[PDB]
Design a protein around this ligand. Sequence first.
Ligand SMILES: [Zn+2]
Lengths: 95, 120, 116
Amino acid sequence: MITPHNILRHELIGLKVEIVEAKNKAMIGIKGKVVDETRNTLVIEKEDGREVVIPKDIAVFLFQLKGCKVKVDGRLLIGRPEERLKKKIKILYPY
Amino acid sequence: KKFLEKKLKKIAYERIDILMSLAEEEAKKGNWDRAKRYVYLARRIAMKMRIRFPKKWKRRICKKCGTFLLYGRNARVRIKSKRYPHVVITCLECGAIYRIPMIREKKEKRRKKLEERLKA
Amino acid sequence: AVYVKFKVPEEIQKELLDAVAKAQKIKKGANEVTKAVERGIAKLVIIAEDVKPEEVVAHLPYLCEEKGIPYAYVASKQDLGKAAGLEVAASSVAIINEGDAEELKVLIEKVNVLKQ
RNA sequence: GGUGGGGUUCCCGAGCGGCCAAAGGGAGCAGACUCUAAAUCUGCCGUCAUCGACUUCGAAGGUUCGAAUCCUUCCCCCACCAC
RNA sequence: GGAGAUGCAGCAGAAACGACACGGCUCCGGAAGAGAUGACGAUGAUAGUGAAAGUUGAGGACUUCCGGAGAACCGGUGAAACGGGCAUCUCCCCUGCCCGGGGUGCAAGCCGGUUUCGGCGCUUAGCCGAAUGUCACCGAAAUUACAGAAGGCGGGCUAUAGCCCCCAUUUU
Ligand SMILES: [Zn+2]
């Protein structure tokens, strides 16, 4: 099962996602699934049919699990998912 | 108190299973390059985690190119056992040809038949 | 235990064996079953659950999931071998022409009900 | 300004690219032992605390089938120098 | 670019770096069943191909095992295999340039002094108990971020203040 604690190490591809906050104004309001994932980038296919390239470190993501909705920064999702499942420890201080 | 019941290798095996299931689910649509990307990421996490492939998704992929092999579409599967028992997978994309020798199971069946002959 | 997708009841297993017994115009051996599901002439595939090595039948169900021919499982291979007409067991049987049991394989379309 | 080096468990300290391989010692807890206590021995030894399994080898990136180890960068800690 | 040596742990696989022993293939010896019988066979039969591979698919049909020796082909494993790779070390096979070779380093080294001190090296800034101060303004490159000489020069790395130039995502 996919847990909100290990979502820092679970695979993001194959999960519906929407973003709630970002510095880009037009980025806010997208909904879709995750297809491709690189070191700080998701390739998201919308339900409308548009592929978008979303950087991770500028936005916060809301991943839709089996019933759950988890809000995680992409600053926590830094690194390739290969190296992220190797081991990546990120500690963020929003002061 | 037990908070972490799932370890690193267990989530690695789950990522193997999810990525290769999504590889099968996305390989039938028409995007073989996306399925090649899934097989490439699963192979990279297999060499990284030092974990072995499951026996379900073991023979469904190609080692040379990395395309997920649909049997019939881009993979030709023929069983020949005249000289030696073998099941041959043939990649239609690049041309890499692999097989499944079954000599030792035939040896076990042969020893069982020898025991049935000697008991009778 | 590995290549099998769904649990098969014993009554529909006996219906499969009765269909193999009533048909008697079949392709036995996994090469002929594979050729029949690649051509599409087969209407029903019967695969034994006790096949060791499993690879001999491991290419069979997913290919049917590509080709849309209904497939089902029996627990014993020697019973399918006796139903096919041989003293020695057979791994898989594809049916080209059912004949008098053709309505019977309509009931084996209820295997699709087991698929969901 | 300069040379020869080191950073690994609470503290002193080893470690061939490979199964917590992580030598360990002292420490804490528990057992054993004793009238009590010291000393000796046994297991946990960071966690679950019975076997066993996972994390940390100053930090990051990269190579590799796989990093305490091999490469690069960022650091700190030593020793001694005015004559 | 070539040769030589080492390593690619553990598990798996016949086999982890040169080739091989091993199983399918051929021969010989022993045992068991059998002449309109019986053994075997859709987990594939007499059966062929440069036998990786592919076409074949049954009143098909004379077989099976063990041990020993050999021309050709083949390895369910693993990242990587009857064969080509990877990394390290050392030599010889090249091309062009330059000729003293190493070691320590200015807190080197030298002098008055003979422990300890002062002078040279030392400066179109040259301190050493480590000097280079404050304000305004043209401009817009400006004391604002990283940040400070200590004999001098040249290369490379690290961290960013202001403007200029170039490239990319969102966008329209
Ligand atoms: Zn291919």
